[PDB]
Amino acid sequence: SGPVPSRARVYTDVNTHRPREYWDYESHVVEWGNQDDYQLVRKLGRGKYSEVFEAINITNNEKVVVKILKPVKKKKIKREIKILENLRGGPNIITLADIVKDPVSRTPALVFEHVNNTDFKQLYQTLTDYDIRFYMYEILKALDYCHSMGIMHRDVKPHNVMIDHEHRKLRLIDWGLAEFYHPGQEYNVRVASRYFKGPELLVDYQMYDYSLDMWSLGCMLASMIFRKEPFFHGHDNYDQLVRIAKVLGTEDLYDYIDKYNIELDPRFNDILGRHSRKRWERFVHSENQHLVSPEALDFLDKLLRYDHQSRLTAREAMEHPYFYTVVKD
Ligand SMILES: COc1ccc(N/C=C2\C(=O)CCc3c2oc2cc(Cl)c(O)c(Cl)c32)cc1
């Protein structure tokens, strides 16, 4: 018995055709720079795996961002480096400019191009309907690119999308959780932030794929067009699935786990309940209606599906009528 296996419906075998060196990140050799080329200006944030600094390339007085990785996992460090180099130059992928050995932490410090990002809590309150569509398309370009290169981001969220709104410039960042997709490979479900975890992670289904990112993007889209950040506001990983079930309904959830022969954590027995699927119009009100269109709701409905295999791919999403009004490059 056990769970039914699953395959990505696009870019399924891209890594198995590439040279081993492309995805065998453990055997990667880092090309080092000079750490005294950079002067740290101010710490921008600290996470479980890194500290991020605004810095200045003191050789050309250029602003950069330095991400000093914590020595928690070495395999994870080579993984993020290899993925950043594999994806370098792709549309709206953050550009890894240099790698140095930080003298204090004695760990790799990644040097990125600088983005004049505005905080997403402040920025999302200002976005028009057109802005949301425009930036959603820009995010899709990055996602389709990394998916086409055999890589899933696995941490899509507003905090990991840097936007220079004055210049309409967008970069997908924090590739510290990204992984190469290998068909049939079972992955760690402790990825992404709670509010953006796909149902596959919440039901402990490990054989997921690029479509995880498309659920996370749908969560971002819902928060933007309905102006509720986050949209699924679970208090823990279990309540997170309950929050989703109160919107998408429990019948489709059971159909999803039945299709893949998944058994829910019995902890859900007394908290999941029975919920009908809600029409998206329940979340429309006077304060967000100018951001809601039939095209937006159809697009959101095709992202926020329990069955990861049924979600729009990034490429399919860019074909959606929701983006007909956006002027393309
Ligand atoms: C508070 O005022 C400001 C102004 C600018 C910023 N800019 C942050 C970033 C960038 O400009 C480069 C990409 C990057 C940034 O933060 C990151 C974090 C991680 Cl974890 C990561 O992997 C990457 Cl690539 C980045 C942040 C705050």
Swiss-Prot record:
Keyword field contains Membrane: no
GO cellular component terms given for this protein: cytosol; nucleoplasm; nucleus; plasma membrane; PML body; protein kinase CK2 complex; Sin3-type complex
Molecular function, one GO term: identical protein binding
Annotated compartments: Nucleus
Primary location: nucleus
Region feature (Interaction with beta subunit): 35-40
Catalytic residues in the record: D155
Domain of life: Eukaryota
Keywords: Apoptosis, ATP-binding, Biological rhythms, Cell cycle, Disease variant, Intellectual disability, Kinase, Nucleotide-binding, Nucleus, Phosphoprotein, Serine/threonine-protein kinase, Transcription, Transcription regulation, Transferase, Wnt signaling pathway
Residues reported in the UniProt entry to bind ATP: L44, G45, R46, G47, K48, Y49, S50, E51, V52, K67
EC number: 2.7.11.1
Single GO BP term: positive regulation of protein catabolic process
Coiled-coil regions listed in the entry: none
Principal EC category: transferase
Tissue specificity field: Expressed in gastric carcinoma tissue and the expression gradually increases with the progression of the carcinoma (at protein level).
Record: disease: Okur-Chung neurodevelopmental syndrome: An autosomal dominant neurodevelopmental disorder characterized by developmental delay, intellectual disability, behavioral problems, hypotonia, speech problems, microcephaly, pachygyria and variable dysmorphic features.
Miscellaneous comment text of the record: Can use both ATP and GTP as phosphoryl donors. Phosphorylation by casein kinase 2 has been estimated to represent up to one quarter of the eukaryotic phosphoproteome. Casein kinase 2 has been found to be increased at protein level and up-regulated at the level of enzyme activity in the majority of cancers. However, elevated levels of casein kinase 2 are present in certain normal organs such as brain and testes.
Subunit structure: Heterotetramer composed of two catalytic subunits (alpha chain and/or alpha' chain) and two regulatory subunits (beta chains). The tetramer can exist as a combination of 2 alpha/2 beta, 2 alpha'/2 beta or 1 alpha/1 alpha'/2 beta subunits. Also part of a CK2-SPT16-SSRP1 complex composed of SSRP1, SUPT16H, CSNK2A1, CSNK2A2 and CSNK2B, which forms following UV irradiation. Interacts with RNPS1. Interacts with SNAI1. Interacts with PML (isoform PML-12). Interacts with CCAR2. Interacts with HIRIP3.
Family recorded in the similarity comment: Belongs to the protein kinase superfamily. Ser/Thr protein kinase family. CK2 subfamily.
Function: Catalytic subunit of a constitutively active serine/threonine-protein kinase complex that phosphorylates a large number of substrates containing acidic residues C-terminal to the phosphorylated serine or threonine. Regulates numerous cellular processes, such as cell cycle progression, apoptosis and transcription, as well as viral infection. May act as a regulatory node which integrates and coordinates numerous signals leading to an appropriate cellular response.
Protein name: Casein kinase II subunit alpha
Gene that specifies this protein: CSNK2A1
Covered residues, full protein: 2 to 330 of 391
